[PDB]
Structure formats: C-alpha cells, structure tokens
Amino acid sequence: EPITQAFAQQFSREWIDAWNAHDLDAILSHYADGFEMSSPMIVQIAGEPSGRLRGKEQVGAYWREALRMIPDLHFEWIATLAGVDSVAIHYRGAKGRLALEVFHFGPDRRVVKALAHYAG
Amino acid sequence: PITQAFAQQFSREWIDAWNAHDLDAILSHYADGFEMSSPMIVQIAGPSGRLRGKEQVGAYWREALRMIPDLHFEWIATLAGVDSVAIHYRGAKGRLALEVFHFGPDRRVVKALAHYAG
C-alpha cells in the first residue's frame, strides 16, 4: 500500500498547523528519532556544505531558534502529493518563498527523512 | 548545491521533452542506471515502486506516450533543494504531479521520485 491520500492530507494539515501554531513539540511529534533533514537553509545557516542535519536535538535547535526569530512565522498550504513512501507538501514559506518539502516515512508512520526545496 | 538557474533550465528542458513526446530527449536528462520510483509502478510492477535504468524505465515511459499520445504537462512551479530539483506540474488528465530529481556529478538525474495528488 503506498502512502494513502487519507494519510497525506491529514499529515499535511497537522504539519502546517503545528508550524503555524509555533508548537515545536507538535512539529517534532511527526518525526522519527534520528530523522535526516536536508535544506538549502542548512547550507547557508548551519554552515554544513552537505545541507544535512540529523536528529531532534540538532534539527530541533534550529527550528526552535527559527520560531524565536520569526515570531509570526506562517506557512500557507498549497498542495500535497503522495509518492511511494513519501508525501510532498507544497506551501508558501514564512517570507513568501515558494516551498516544496518531501517527507519520507518509516515503519511507525513518522518522518525519517525530509528534504526542503525553494524558489522565489 | 543546486542553483536556481540550473533548476529552472532543467525544468524547461524536462517539461519540453515530455510535451514534444520525445523519449530520447526525456532520457537524455538522466544518468545511465538511474533509479525512479512512482506509486504507479507499485500498482503495475507490484512495493518499493522502483525501476532502474534507461532500458526498463524507457519502456514504461514509451508505454505512457503510446497510451496518451496527446500528453501535455502544464508546468506549475520548479523548486531547488540541496541536490534535488522539484518540478510541480499538471500531468495526464489534469492530475497534479510532482517529480523530485536528485542529480549526479555530471548534472544528470540519478534518482527520481514521482508524486501525485489524489
């Protein structure tokens, strides 16, 4: 059974809402221990040429600071598309960038790997 | 990392190749031995949803073009990640789609993952 649309939509609505609520515990609840995070923002900010960070402590530290610095952070959900073991959430970012985040899920239905993409 | 200039040009190329119904051109963007996943493959081929290589994957896309001879992809957006590009488009029958492309050292696709709206 590939990722169901039931799941993809409900995941998307909770993930968007968790970010919009600036509720880091809620956000992190969707992720597996040791999840991998890839983002152009990691290259730039974290100073990691690979653009990768791993785990809730390490990735959470950045997100915690994002919420602190961007106190009225808000994402607009545009679309969700389902793949085999992944969901892609297309949304408009906190500063108007267009975003497309791919989430790969593990056995427990939590995100084991996420990759961010942007334009604009 | 991938640049925005690269991503947008790649996307123009990929959408155009599909809209020209040009299997050779489509495949020219991919590395030999590339991997591709799609929830369509799960259904047809039967869990990973994966095919590999230009022989195997080309067969499938050859069949797609034969089944939908007036296939047209309406481009919606292209986004850049660290080693990947995401192309969002309206595909066959107006279904929204997304293809994620991971690139190798010669700027060709080594891994691609299809996603569809429902």
Tab-separated table of N, CA, C and O in Angstrom, chain A residues 2 5 38-40 43 49-52 79-88 90 98-100 102 104 115-120, chain B residues 1 4 8 37-39 42-43 47-49 77-82 84-86 88 96-98 100 102 113-118:
chain	number	residue	atom	x	y	z
A	2	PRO	N	0.918	1.985	-1.125
A	2	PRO	CA	1.631	3.266	-0.996
A	2	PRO	C	0.955	4.207	0.023
A	2	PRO	O	-0.160	3.948	0.485
A	5	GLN	N	-3.876	8.782	0.456
A	5	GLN	CA	-4.195	10.203	0.412
A	5	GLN	C	-4.823	10.603	1.767
A	5	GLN	O	-4.621	11.727	2.219
A	38	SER	N	17.422	17.737	5.111
A	38	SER	CA	18.187	18.420	4.082
A	38	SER	C	17.527	19.708	3.710
A	38	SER	O	16.336	19.727	3.457
A	39	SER	N	18.272	20.799	3.726
A	39	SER	CA	17.694	22.056	3.275
A	39	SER	C	18.756	23.027	2.771
A	39	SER	O	19.831	23.126	3.364
A	40	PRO	N	18.437	23.803	1.740
A	40	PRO	CA	19.355	24.887	1.361
A	40	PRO	C	19.617	25.835	2.537
A	40	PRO	O	20.690	26.471	2.608
A	43	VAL	N	22.663	24.721	4.537
A	43	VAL	CA	23.928	25.050	3.948
A	43	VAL	C	24.285	26.428	4.367
A	43	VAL	O	25.425	26.727	4.772
A	49	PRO	N	28.053	22.229	4.350
A	49	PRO	CA	28.025	22.113	2.885
A	49	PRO	C	27.117	21.031	2.327
A	49	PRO	O	26.596	21.181	1.227
A	50	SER	N	26.909	19.962	3.081
A	50	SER	CA	26.003	18.913	2.649
A	50	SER	C	24.571	19.347	2.698
A	50	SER	O	23.749	18.713	2.084
A	51	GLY	N	24.274	20.364	3.504
A	51	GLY	CA	22.899	20.800	3.749
A	51	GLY	C	22.110	19.861	4.628
A	51	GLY	O	20.904	19.967	4.658
A	52	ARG	N	22.796	18.992	5.377
A	52	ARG	CA	22.115	17.968	6.186
A	52	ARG	C	22.376	18.132	7.688
A	52	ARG	O	23.485	18.464	8.129
A	79	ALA	N	-0.540	22.518	-1.828
A	79	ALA	CA	-0.973	21.209	-2.293
A	79	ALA	C	-0.177	20.123	-1.618
A	79	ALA	O	0.937	20.352	-1.174
A	80	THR	N	-0.718	18.913	-1.602
A	80	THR	CA	0.032	17.781	-1.121
A	80	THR	C	-0.027	16.688	-2.175
A	80	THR	O	-1.109	16.423	-2.735
A	81	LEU	N	1.101	16.051	-2.411
A	81	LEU	CA	1.165	14.998	-3.430
A	81	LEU	C	1.794	13.785	-2.783
A	81	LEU	O	2.676	13.914	-1.946
A	82	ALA	N	1.280	12.623	-3.113
A	82	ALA	CA	1.731	11.380	-2.466
A	82	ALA	C	2.585	10.558	-3.400
A	82	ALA	O	2.255	10.365	-4.551
A	83	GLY	N	3.662	10.002	-2.841
A	83	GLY	CA	4.513	9.077	-3.558
A	83	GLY	C	4.462	7.678	-2.979
A	83	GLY	O	3.422	7.199	-2.562
A	84	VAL	N	5.569	6.955	-3.031
A	84	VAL	CA	5.546	5.564	-2.533
A	84	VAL	C	5.595	5.545	-1.024
A	84	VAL	O	4.689	5.062	-0.331
A	85	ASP	N	6.661	6.129	-0.498
A	85	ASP	CA	6.830	6.185	0.953
A	85	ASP	C	6.986	7.631	1.382
A	85	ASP	O	7.377	7.906	2.535
A	86	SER	N	6.576	8.551	0.510
A	86	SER	CA	6.775	9.966	0.781
A	86	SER	C	5.533	10.799	0.466
A	86	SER	O	4.632	10.358	-0.312
A	87	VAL	N	5.489	11.954	1.119
A	87	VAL	CA	4.479	12.977	0.894
A	87	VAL	C	5.250	14.229	0.541
A	87	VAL	O	6.287	14.514	1.132
A	88	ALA	N	4.744	14.992	-0.403
A	88	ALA	CA	5.351	16.276	-0.760
A	88	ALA	C	4.369	17.340	-0.421
A	88	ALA	O	3.219	17.280	-0.878
A	90	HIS	N	3.582	21.254	-0.702
A	90	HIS	CA	3.911	22.460	-1.444
A	90	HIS	C	3.230	23.555	-0.658
A	90	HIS	O	2.030	23.495	-0.377
A	98	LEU	N	8.341	30.228	-2.202
A	98	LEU	CA	7.630	29.025	-2.555
A	98	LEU	C	8.468	27.860	-2.065
A	98	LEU	O	9.681	27.835	-2.205
A	99	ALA	N	7.791	26.874	-1.494
A	99	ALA	CA	8.437	25.744	-0.892
A	99	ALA	C	7.802	24.446	-1.294
A	99	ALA	O	6.617	24.325	-1.564
A	100	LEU	N	8.634	23.428	-1.265
A	100	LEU	CA	8.218	22.074	-1.581
A	100	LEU	C	9.104	21.144	-0.754
A	100	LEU	O	10.310	20.990	-0.960
A	102	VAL	N	9.673	17.393	0.919
A	102	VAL	CA	9.395	15.997	0.712
A	102	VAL	C	9.693	15.275	2.024
A	102	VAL	O	10.799	15.441	2.611
A	104	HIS	N	9.779	11.530	3.820
A	104	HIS	CA	9.806	10.099	3.730
A	104	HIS	C	9.460	9.511	5.067
A	104	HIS	O	9.937	9.962	6.106
A	115	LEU	N	13.352	16.666	2.932
A	115	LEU	CA	14.219	17.485	2.055
A	115	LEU	C	13.397	18.702	1.647
A	115	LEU	O	12.297	18.573	1.140
A	116	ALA	N	13.962	19.888	1.865
A	116	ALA	CA	13.326	21.133	1.560
A	116	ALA	C	13.802	21.625	0.177
A	116	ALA	O	14.975	21.442	-0.204
A	117	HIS	N	12.910	22.313	-0.528
A	117	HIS	CA	13.186	22.896	-1.816
A	117	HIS	C	12.497	24.224	-1.837
A	117	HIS	O	11.384	24.361	-1.306
A	118	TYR	N	13.132	25.221	-2.459
A	118	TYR	CA	12.547	26.562	-2.544
A	118	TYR	C	12.713	27.225	-3.880
A	118	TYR	O	13.587	26.862	-4.675
A	119	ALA	N	11.845	28.219	-4.125
A	119	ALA	CA	12.000	29.154	-5.223
A	119	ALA	C	11.446	30.529	-4.805
A	119	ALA	O	10.699	30.672	-3.803
A	120	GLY	N	11.806	31.534	-5.575
A	120	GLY	CA	11.192	32.843	-5.487
A	120	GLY	C	11.911	33.658	-4.465
A	120	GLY	O	11.375	34.688	-4.003
B	1	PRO	N	25.926	23.118	-3.837
B	1	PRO	CA	24.477	22.788	-4.025
B	1	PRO	C	23.872	23.219	-5.383
B	1	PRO	O	24.480	23.993	-6.120
B	4	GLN	N	19.378	27.811	-8.525
B	4	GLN	CA	18.082	28.151	-9.071
B	4	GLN	C	18.121	28.249	-10.617
B	4	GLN	O	17.176	27.793	-11.285
B	8	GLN	N	15.702	25.835	-12.933
B	8	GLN	CA	14.694	26.359	-13.803
B	8	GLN	C	14.951	25.930	-15.248
B	8	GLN	O	14.019	25.604	-15.968
B	37	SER	N	11.132	6.005	-8.829
B	37	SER	CA	10.048	5.450	-8.081
B	37	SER	C	8.789	6.204	-8.432
B	37	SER	O	8.788	7.392	-8.697
B	38	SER	N	7.704	5.447	-8.458
B	38	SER	CA	6.394	6.006	-8.636
B	38	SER	C	5.321	5.121	-8.009
B	38	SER	O	5.415	3.914	-8.075
B	39	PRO	N	4.276	5.734	-7.456
B	39	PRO	CA	3.206	4.918	-6.935
B	39	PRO	C	2.479	4.197	-8.052
B	39	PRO	O	1.797	3.178	-7.812
B	42	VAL	N	4.163	0.747	-8.277
B	42	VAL	CA	3.704	-0.167	-7.233
B	42	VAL	C	2.528	-0.963	-7.700
B	42	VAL	O	2.439	-2.174	-7.510
B	43	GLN	N	1.602	-0.252	-8.320
B	43	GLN	CA	0.377	-0.828	-8.800
B	43	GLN	C	0.655	-1.839	-9.936
B	43	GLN	O	0.195	-2.987	-9.901
B	47	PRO	N	6.631	-2.996	-4.275
B	47	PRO	CA	6.322	-2.308	-3.012
B	47	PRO	C	7.132	-1.036	-2.911
B	47	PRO	O	6.614	0.022	-2.534
B	48	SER	N	8.392	-1.147	-3.318
B	48	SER	CA	9.287	-0.021	-3.454
B	48	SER	C	8.850	0.914	-4.587
B	48	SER	O	9.247	2.075	-4.595
B	49	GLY	N	8.078	0.401	-5.551
B	49	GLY	CA	7.615	1.207	-6.704
B	49	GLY	C	8.735	1.610	-7.624
B	49	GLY	O	8.659	2.647	-8.287
B	77	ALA	N	5.397	24.932	-11.083
B	77	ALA	CA	6.469	25.530	-10.312
B	77	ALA	C	7.675	24.605	-10.283
B	77	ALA	O	7.554	23.389	-10.283
B	78	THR	N	8.840	25.203	-10.143
B	78	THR	CA	10.071	24.429	-10.007
B	78	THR	C	10.801	24.981	-8.798
B	78	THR	O	10.939	26.197	-8.677
B	79	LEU	N	11.306	24.094	-7.957
B	79	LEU	CA	11.964	24.486	-6.710
B	79	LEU	C	13.278	23.772	-6.605
B	79	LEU	O	13.416	22.682	-7.102
B	80	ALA	N	14.223	24.405	-5.940
B	80	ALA	CA	15.564	23.852	-5.768
B	80	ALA	C	15.852	23.472	-4.347
B	80	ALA	O	15.644	24.250	-3.434
B	81	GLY	N	16.396	22.244	-4.199
B	81	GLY	CA	16.880	21.750	-2.941
B	81	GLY	C	18.408	21.719	-2.983
B	81	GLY	O	19.044	22.381	-3.803
B	82	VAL	N	18.990	20.969	-2.068
B	82	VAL	CA	20.466	20.902	-1.967
B	82	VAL	C	21.025	20.092	-3.137
B	82	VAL	O	21.917	20.570	-3.849
B	84	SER	N	18.662	18.328	-5.266
B	84	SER	CA	17.493	17.915	-5.975
B	84	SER	C	16.737	19.121	-6.480
B	84	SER	O	16.928	20.239	-6.028
B	85	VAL	N	15.930	18.832	-7.479
B	85	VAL	CA	15.002	19.776	-8.062
B	85	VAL	C	13.651	19.130	-7.957
B	85	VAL	O	13.482	17.940	-8.203
B	86	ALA	N	12.639	19.974	-7.698
B	86	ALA	CA	11.264	19.531	-7.662
B	86	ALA	C	10.502	20.267	-8.734
B	86	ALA	O	10.500	21.506	-8.767
B	88	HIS	N	6.754	20.697	-10.175
B	88	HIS	CA	5.333	20.584	-9.955
B	88	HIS	C	4.605	20.990	-11.238
B	88	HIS	O	4.908	22.007	-11.851
B	96	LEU	N	-2.591	16.682	-10.731
B	96	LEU	CA	-1.417	17.387	-10.249
B	96	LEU	C	-0.339	16.381	-9.902
B	96	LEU	O	-0.607	15.307	-9.313
B	97	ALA	N	0.885	16.805	-10.160
B	97	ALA	CA	2.005	15.916	-10.064
B	97	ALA	C	3.212	16.644	-9.568
B	97	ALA	O	3.317	17.895	-9.644
B	98	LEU	N	4.157	15.839	-9.123
B	98	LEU	CA	5.409	16.351	-8.694
B	98	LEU	C	6.437	15.295	-9.007
B	98	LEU	O	6.230	14.096	-8.921
B	100	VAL	N	10.485	14.667	-8.171
B	100	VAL	CA	11.679	15.096	-7.483
B	100	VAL	C	12.868	14.432	-8.155
B	100	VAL	O	12.832	13.234	-8.396
B	102	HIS	N	17.102	13.943	-8.163
B	102	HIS	CA	18.388	14.025	-7.490
B	102	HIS	C	19.438	13.917	-8.537
B	102	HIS	O	19.349	13.084	-9.427
B	113	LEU	N	11.652	10.641	-8.197
B	113	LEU	CA	10.546	10.135	-7.425
B	113	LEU	C	9.308	10.878	-7.848
B	113	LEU	O	9.270	12.097	-7.801
B	114	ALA	N	8.318	10.119	-8.296
B	114	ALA	CA	7.070	10.740	-8.738
B	114	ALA	C	6.103	10.815	-7.549
B	114	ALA	O	6.048	9.904	-6.731
B	115	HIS	N	5.291	11.864	-7.535
B	115	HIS	CA	4.229	12.071	-6.554
B	115	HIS	C	3.036	12.618	-7.297
B	115	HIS	O	3.184	13.345	-8.278
B	116	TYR	N	1.846	12.238	-6.855
B	116	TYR	CA	0.595	12.656	-7.460
B	116	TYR	C	-0.396	13.062	-6.422
B	116	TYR	O	-0.439	12.504	-5.317
B	117	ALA	N	-1.229	14.032	-6.785
B	117	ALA	CA	-2.302	14.432	-5.942
B	117	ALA	C	-3.424	13.404	-6.113
B	117	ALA	O	-3.421	12.627	-7.072
B	118	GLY	N	-4.361	13.395	-5.169
B	118	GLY	CA	-5.480	12.441	-5.210
B	118	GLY	C	-6.795	13.126	-4.927
B	118	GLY	O	-7.708	12.500	-4.373
